[PDB]
From a paper:
The natural product Obafluorin (OB) is a potent inhibitor of bacterial threonyl-tRNA synthetase (ThrRS). Our previous work showed that OB covalently binds to ThrRS, forming an ester bond with a tyrosine residue in the catalytic center via the highly strained β-lactone ring, making OB the first covalent aaRS inhibitor with demonstrated crystal structures. The binding of OB induces a large conformational change in ThrRS.
In particular, Gly463 is adjacent to Tyr462, which is the residue covalently bound to OB, and Leu489 is located within 7 Å of the OB in the pocket. The results showed that 36j and OB increased the Tm of EcThrRS_L489M by 22.7 °C and 22.6 °C, respectively, suggesting that OB strongly binds to EcThrRS_L489M, similar to 36j. OB had a strong inhibitory effect on EcThrRS_L489M, with an IC50 value of 215 nM. Therefore, the mutation of Leu489 to a methionine does not confer resistance of EcThrRS to OB. An EcThrRS_L489M–OB complex structure was successfully obtained by cocrystallizing 300 μM EcThrRS_L489M protein with 600 μM OB. Because in the OB-binding conformation, the active pocket has a larger opening, we refer to this state as the “open state”.
Author numbering:
A (entry chain A), B (entry chain B): 242 to 641
Write the structure that this text describes.
């Protein structure tokens, strides 16, 4: 149950000294990452998020306007070009504000949800690096919501429901929620902080989430909600974050025309559900010990023949399953059938399809799961539709 | 017919001085970019490429091993981390060799086709930057093929077929091809170069492609084939490149176990069809003058009502088209039908559905193209079928 060992065994990823804390995604690992992209994207459509893409580096002058340069300059990678300093972005927030600043915005346009699979880079200490979970380069399921003060409580409601929607997909039901209150050094009045913390507190009340305060741990520009999930080994993982911000939109001159025809600064909500997806894949690898759900598996079906008298029956069925959008491979090697099954059981392939002349004539397939249960011979069309339903529903459990 | 002018009008992207030569992709522009990813990935499956993902930056020590540091140090962004220097990758070639080096490779594993949507950054002179077409940060439809010397002809043939397959999708048929022979300073013997240039020359001759010798224009590590497509304005655009490399795999300790059990250094083919994806989108924007094909359009269908008595019929119809994988949005505003239709014609929306009392009862839609042609009132399921076929087939033309 160590993702670094399982990652090398299943040929998912590797890392090396020439790029500390940066991931070489192999084909199978990149398949798992891309499937997470689709799953998150399906949520963005349902929750009505835009998806954007910001550049990897911006002028250091811009990063000074945000106030983050004075705080986290050592964690930033800096480069030079024609006597100008550029910073590789460790966050997507200033970039999203820049998209927001293009073209006059009105209250008609709010709330405006803006998501990005933004690649961020942080100059993390090398001694702290560990596998997929403490890295220098990571992709964040990041989003930013621009809205009015009145729309804060409803927008946070969507973020809260989004958090439990996505976690329950992976089987994470034990979630601990903490709210961070105002720190010693902060901006804004006490009154503004009172309603900001109330909006987070109320939004958790309307969802029946019991939570717990983390006193003084909030950022200097707003309180936040942090979600912590517990794996099958009862290890806490802090993944979700909903962060209010009353500083950055004003620092970057973001504005909209309100109902009263006066110019107003919008409120920014920073939200991430999975946090670092490279880290999240590490959690999934150890939570499932490599036995990924069928929708996440790099190879979903392997079809084998007993002899060569079925090699192109396998070939036709491999094509037939491929046209169904199933990641399927064929194993026509001159090896014992037991040797082939142990080969792909070791690789954690969800389903093994075995074809003898018993099933070739009847147009059926013997089906075996990686766990070992033999489901007998069933119609190919019935097998394909069952496989589709499992993949489309992202079912945690296989057949029976 | 200016990609920059069309980009701002259709809200595709924007650029600013805070990140010169770098593109902020908006929601509509990022839809076009992601659709090209799907199209390219469709070709990768057909031609059996692996898709991997390399790190965004790597140690400058490795870049000195490749020999690229001596020649292209001025074009590389560099950063520091714990008294070590790292270069943001201007190319994906060393990263793919690192992935290939993990695990001993046999001759049975070749040809190894490895593709990546690599994000490369180059310190281009800011005075030369131009919109989407000369940029500092770009994404490349990149790939590298590892094979033996006997496999070069067959692999180059596949690259040539893929070049014309993808260009024909976008309506580019006039393509000019040039072969760059040996330069004054080069590695390897004459016989190696004689064989290498012959393989490129023979492959171009077999495919009956007229080609012009670019005498002395090849790289020092191998000859190359460059493809230039001509747009509807008869302007030349150099996009495709096929480079043979006999230096880097030996420099980076790449090897495989041959059928004679003697370890050999493989041959690398550097391959890109579209070149920079930002640049290709710019060419496509000017080629169509914003009238994107239905499969690339950010919004494919707009459904409108006549009065408020059909707002519900549009809403279910929009959802019904949405479930069919069609990018559809509803326009239920309180504006005249002529005002609505112009609003979405200016936005180059391919199709516009109109619902009065006549079609709500009959379960039909009045369908109009952005060219201005009325197609009458047809069945809802029939227009959904025809829309999917046009999207699935990537049709340049519309209905009729
Ligand atoms: O937590 C978040 N922001 C915080 C405030 O806003 C601030 O970004 C904290 C921080 C930034 C950069 C570094 N660093 O090491 O460069 C460390 C800490 C945050 C969480 C999820 C999504 C987002 O877009 C978010 O912005
Ligand atoms: O053309 C290619 N390689 C050539 C050899 O291999 C070499 O890459 C030329 C080069 C130009 C400019 C810079 N630069 O830093 O501005 C670096 C290298 C090439 C073409 C398609 C795909 C790829 O991955 C390819 O590599
Ligand atoms: Zn943020
Ligand atoms: Zn290359």
């Amino acid at each position: 149950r160590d993702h670094r060992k399982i990652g090398k065994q299943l040929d998912l990823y590797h890392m090396q000294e020439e790029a500390p804390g940066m991931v070489f995604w192999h084909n199978d690992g990149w398949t798992i990452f891309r499937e997470l992209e689709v799953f998150v994207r399906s949520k963005l459509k349902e929750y009505q998020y835009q998806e954007v893409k910001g550049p990897f580096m911006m002028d250091r002058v811009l990063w000074e306007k945000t106030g983050h340069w004075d705080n986290y300059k050592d964690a930033m990678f800096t480069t030079s070009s024609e006597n100008r300093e550029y910073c590789i972005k460790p966050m997507n927030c200033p970039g999203h504000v820049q998209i927001f600043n293009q073209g006059l915005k009105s209250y008609r346009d709010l709330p405006l949800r803006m998501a990005e699979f933004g690649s961020c880079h942080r100059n993390e200490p090398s001694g702290s690096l560990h596998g997929l979970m403490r890295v220098r380069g990571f992709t964040q399921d990041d989003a930013h919501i621009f809205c009015t003060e009145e729309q804060i409580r409803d927008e946070v409601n969507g973020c809260i429901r989004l958090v439990y929607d996505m976690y329950s997909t992976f089987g994470f039901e034990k979630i601990v929620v903490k709210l961070s209150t105002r720190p010693e050094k902060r901006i804004g009045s006490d009154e503004m902080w009172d309603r900001a913390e109330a909006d987070l507190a109320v939004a958790l009340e309307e969802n029946n989430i019991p939570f717990e305060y983390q006193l003084g741990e909030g950022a200097f520009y707003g309180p936040k909600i942090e979600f912590t999930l517990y794996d099958c080994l009862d290890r806490a993982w802090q993944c979700g974050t909903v962060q209010l911000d009353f500083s950055m939109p004003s620092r970057l001159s973001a504005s909209y025309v309100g109902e009263d025809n006066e110019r107003k600064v919008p409120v920014m909500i920073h939200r991430a559900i999975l946090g670092s997806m490279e880290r999240f894949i590490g959690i999934l690898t150890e939570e499932f010990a490599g036995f990924f759900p069928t929708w996440l598996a790099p190879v979903q079906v392997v079809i084998m023949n007993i002899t060569d008298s079925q090699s192109e029956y396998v070939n036709e069925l491999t094509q037939k399953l491929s046209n169904a959008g199933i990641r399927v491979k064929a194993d026509l090697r001159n090896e014992k059938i037991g040797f082939k099954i142990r080969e792909h059981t070791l690789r954690r392939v969800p389903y093994m399809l075995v074809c003898g002349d018993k099933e070739v004539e009847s147009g059926k397939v013997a089906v075996r799961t990686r766990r070992g249960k033999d489901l007998g011979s069933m119609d190919v069309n019935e097998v394909i539709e069952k496989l589709q339903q499992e993949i489309r529903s992202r079912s945690l459990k296989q057949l029976e």
